């Protein structure tokens, strides 16, 4: 059935949403290890703003710790804790 | 609490996830108008695969109809129906 306007509007407005984030994006200086899984689920700001000139960005954020399989190609692999930023609150701010 | 490896691994693996998608991306021929909301919530394949050479892609798809406000700037606006593609099933396939 057809999704009603106010439902679409409220569901898509700027807010934290579970987002699958590549670990290399979070750790852009990593050039030694590869990771399993290669991505992690994190709450991140997403969606749209009333004003098209605004973007959805975090106003509160905090880290979560996840166990990741850290692989050194052709050498070995280890379960290790890694920290990832999550967004707790979002707002629409000038782009 | 530290998220356990097997929990992260299972939660991040290739599957359909709610994704906030920009309308003008899905409909690049809609030049003359703007839309409210400007993005919509859609189930889309997301997450990661066991092999860096694989990608998460849809194997089953369907459409969904949503009420969206179509706006002609400083002229007028109308609530109409628009159809969007969703992903119902995903698999990891060779890029």
Swiss-Prot record, chains A, B:
Disulfide bonds join 14-56, 45-90, 49-92. Induction: By hypoxia. Regulated by growth factors, cytokines, gonadotropins, nitric oxide, hypoglycemia and oncogenic mutations. It comes from the Eukaryota. Glycans are attached at residue 63. Higher expression in pituitary tumors than the pituitary gland. It is linked to Microvascular complications of diabetes 1: Pathological conditions that develop in numerous tissues and organs as a consequence of diabetes mellitus. They include diabetic retinopathy, diabetic nephropathy leading to end-stage renal disease, and diabetic neuropathy. Diabetic retinopathy remains the major cause of new-onset blindness among diabetic adults. It is characterized by vascular permeability and increased tissue ischemia and angiogenesis. Belongs to the PDGF/VEGF growth factor family. This is Vascular endothelial growth factor A, long form.
